[PDB]
Symmetry: C4
Subunit: 233 residues, 4 copies
């Protein structure tokens, strides 16, 4: 619970939980006829994966579960450069294992088609859920990634009352999904996008680069804003 391999295991398990729960709710439950959970149910699910695992393993690894979080916290002066790559690998691996099991579960229902349905992948333009342009996709992911990082930096500030951060951060995740699912299906998380794109297997992989660079640039901006403008004291 403090040697690096335990932190990496925590990060893998937490990103697994995020992908399995968030994407799983989208694939299995969102569009279920009459009773299905909708975009709002998916948004809640994503936020709860983050809230629950932040409480469960946050005291072990920091509970990032998201390459743009790790890199943003590096930019914000909160996390060492030398640990970044190990965390990103752990997150990507955890997420892919989750998408794999989800793919197996989803395949047990007649008619399931990962490629055709999109398998909860992030896309823009032709592949945005609401047909939003690439420019709309860029602006929304940049803003929401920066804000998510600003919220993470603030809620874990020296002077923020202790213990509440998993609630602030997890519900910031729900919020972000409530806003942006129609635009990009909501990434703000390169590991989540990657895990699911692998099984969609087509356009998701062709557009994947976008859901690495934009959330990471946004997260860096959020970390820099907090570090340079809000933190001092």
């Amino acid at each position: 619970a403090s040697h690096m391999f335990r932190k990496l295991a925590a990060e893998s398990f937490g990103t697994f939980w995020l992908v399995f729960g968030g994407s799983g709710s989208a694939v299995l439950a969102a569009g279920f006829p009459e009773l299905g959970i909708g975009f709002a149910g998916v948004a809640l699910a994503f936020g709860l994966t983050v809230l629950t695992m932040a409480f469960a393993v946050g005291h072990i690894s920091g509970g990032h579960f998201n390459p743009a979080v790790t890199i943003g916290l590096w930019a914000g002066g909160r996390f060492p450069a030398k640990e970044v790559v190990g965390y990103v690998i752990a997150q990507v691996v955890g997420g892919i294992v989750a998408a794999a099991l989800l793919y197996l579960i989803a395949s047990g229902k007649t008619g399931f088609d990962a490629a055709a349905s999109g398998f909860a992948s992030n896309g823009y333009g032709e592949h945005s859920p609401g047909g939003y342009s690439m420019l709309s996709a860029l602006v929304v992911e940049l803003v929401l990634s920066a804000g998510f990082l600003l919220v993470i930096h603030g809620a874990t500030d020296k002077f923020a009352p202790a213990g509440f951060a998993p609630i602030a951060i997890g519900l910031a995740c729900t919020l972000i999904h409530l806003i942006s699912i129609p635009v990009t299906n909501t990434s703000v998380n390169p590991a989540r996008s990657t895990a699911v794109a692998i099984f969609q297997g087509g356009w998701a992989l062709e557009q994947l680069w976008f859901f690495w660079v934009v959330p990471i640039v946004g997260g860096i901006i959020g970390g820099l804003i907090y570090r340079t403008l809000l933190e001092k004291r």
Copy 2:
């Protein structure tokens, strides 16, 4: 509030609340025409029964309310073997009393049919809400049971900030229902499955064995992972 019969009463009352509230929301409110609460409303209800009773009686018994939780915590080194069976009996009894009163309440509406409607029971294949295969049912219940146990172990770790665990655990329950209702109607709780199966009275009882072994195996895996991989320090 610390002699065993008070702990057993707490466990019975808490499992009663889980079954009455979670299953009750499903039976009475989920499909109500136009205004009904849907799968997302049921998921919220299940999580709130756990959150509320964990705050109410967690300081008395540990607030398990779930045979797979009790057994998983035993596997994780958090709970003594000698207390396991008493807790499981208390949970099963509490749950059956709840399903009985729910059955009475539900029967007060013209047309109600427990057997035909399924009475919120857990099933797979032919009896999965979305027609998922037995293999889909196995994987989802194994993963979500293990994760639920991992979340419970982590949120109650020595180094997790105090007081927040009922929130982490209750909302993990909501999450689990948001994901898996279409697959199995969501068990991860052998006492919940049993209580309701008794009144459905048919296929629910024929498939009940599955919702004992799979959540318990999953909970044991989650406890072992936390104990052997994440806990040390």
Copy 3:
């Protein structure tokens, strides 16, 4: 914030907030075409009125906002008999003022009809939303009132971690509404039922006696169970 007239003002304001917010969400928003909030949105609203005011004025009066809570806490040995009646009056008055303003607001939309729509009143049988029998109404209100009191006693126990009770109690209120709206429109609160019945002006007033005796009997049972079975230590 501790002399009795401040406590009574807190109780009046808090019950006003409960009635205005819970009933208001039901009257104004629940059935709004396409976008309306449904039973689940109303349940959330009721729970949030309780959560928010418990945090706002709980440190002043105890934050009961509900005659069955006050009386149940008396039964549970937590609240003095000599203060009960003043609290009940304050709650009833606060609630009626709220229903009055809500009635005014609702009347500003063409077609509004308090009597015909039911104005969010509690009823059974012919006047149950789902056509549930009087016996169904009795059992559900008895169980949910007792459980609500058990949750309140437990979450505010000596050994419950401090500060979290408004969350446990407010979300127990949401849960209770998620379960029972189809049966009785959910009372568990005699002051809420009274305030709204006055403006429905017909069957609501004829059935009002029921939503005084049943929640109060239930609350007393919950308080007695906690006091006599769960509290000692």
Copy 4:
């Protein structure tokens, strides 16, 4: 994080987040065919913007994000007159930048029409979502603004347990939206109304004066009630 320009930056960022998230969820997600989030999803989004930023930057500026909050806290004796105007400017500026980026994002979907759709603006009468009269609009905004201020004063009282206020206040915001969206689309926040009215560009601007005076009068009333009736001790 305590010199005034950091507090003003916090207030600008927080009001940006409120407008971008709350209005954004309304513009992009509320009416999305089949899966859209509805009024309840928007209400949740508004409350989460406030909850998340209150945790993130509340320890910096007080986390007002709302001209009626700033002015109400002045009225309640909690905030100095000399800092009011700077906060109000910061909130208005933050909000307008957010509406501008939202306008850009929304414009990336074929058919988008800010003026015709209303762009999430607040209105009454002809421009109330449910066709409520100006009098209905007045009463609901007055009551909900006063209550929101009462909740803010209480949750941050000397004797309220520490750390929980962002939860009480953010969820009070969700509640307020659950109630009143059909009446006015919910203001209780002059900066939110202004930011969005600018881009609707028509009736929203003609009715804007109303969503300055009414929330501010209401907030002042709430602050005065708490200060003069509830606070002493």
